[PDB]
């Protein structure tokens, strides 16, 4: 339940992400791995990255980051009516990448932390609150799909 007004602030912030998705994507993943290092273990391609300097140099990290944020933007733009963009995501993350719902909370916070560090003048009190409700709706739908898949 975001109001139209909140969907709008979400989409205005998202616009800044879209002017550089791969740079924001890389920062988001280095923020999650620095803050919850155990999340790094689900990424077989990144098992072996040892420093922030190796994460910054990694070509595959830039790509997964990019892919992650392109898929999130596609959902957000649906404004809550994302059942179909969401199912395949839940299927893959539940059954193949095996991501627990808590990890969805860690990535939500890295996303907020990156928007906050990069766009402080555009990520005021209002945009913070709208963004945060949108990520929460996203986690709650994911969790519901998980339960339904029997996980
Ligand atoms: C914003 C929430 C997320 C979105 C939108 C997202 C999106 C995606 C997409 C679109 C793919 C590629 C296709 C697929 O396998 O479904 C992918 C792959 C993957 N995701 Fe996520 N993801 C999210 C959260 C996470 C989290 C929190 C983790 C682990 C902590 C994770 C782990 C993985 C792994 C291990 C892969 C395979 C990557 C590879 O080596 O190519 N995802 N993700």
Swiss-Prot record:
Cellular compartments per GO CC: sarcoplasm
A GO biological process held by the record: oxygen transport
Subunit structure: Monomeric.
GO terms for MF: heme binding; metal ion binding; nitrite reductase activity; oxygen binding; oxygen carrier activity; peroxidase activity
Sites bearing Phosphoserine, chain numbering: 3
Source organism of the structure: Sus scrofa
Keywords, comma-separated and alphabetical: Cytoplasm, Heme, Iron, Metal-binding, Muscle protein, Oxidoreductase, Oxygen transport, Phosphoprotein, Transport
Subcellular location: Cytoplasm, Sarcoplasm
Modified residues (Phosphothreonine): 67
Domain Globin residues, every copy: 1-147
Listed Pfam families: Globin
InterPro entries: Globin, Globin-like_sf, Myoglobin
Protein name: Myoglobin
EC identifiers of the protein: 1.7.-.-, 1.11.1.-
Family statement drawn from the similarity comment of this UniProt entry: Belongs to the globin family.
Intrachain disulfide bonds: none
Role according to the record: Monomeric heme protein which primary function is to store oxygen and facilitate its diffusion within muscle tissues. Reversibly binds oxygen through a pentacoordinated heme iron and enables its timely and efficient release as needed during periods of heightened demand. Depending on the oxidative conditions of tissues and cells, and in addition to its ability to bind oxygen, it also has a nitrite reductase activity whereby it regulates the production of bioactive nitric oxide.
Any coiled-coil regions, as ranges: none
Gene encoding the protein: MB
Binding site for O2: 64
Binding-site positions, heme b: 93
Catalytic reactions on record: Fe(III)-heme b-[protein] + nitric oxide + H2O = Fe(II)-heme b-[protein] + nitrite + 2 H(+); H2O2 + AH2 = A + 2 H2O
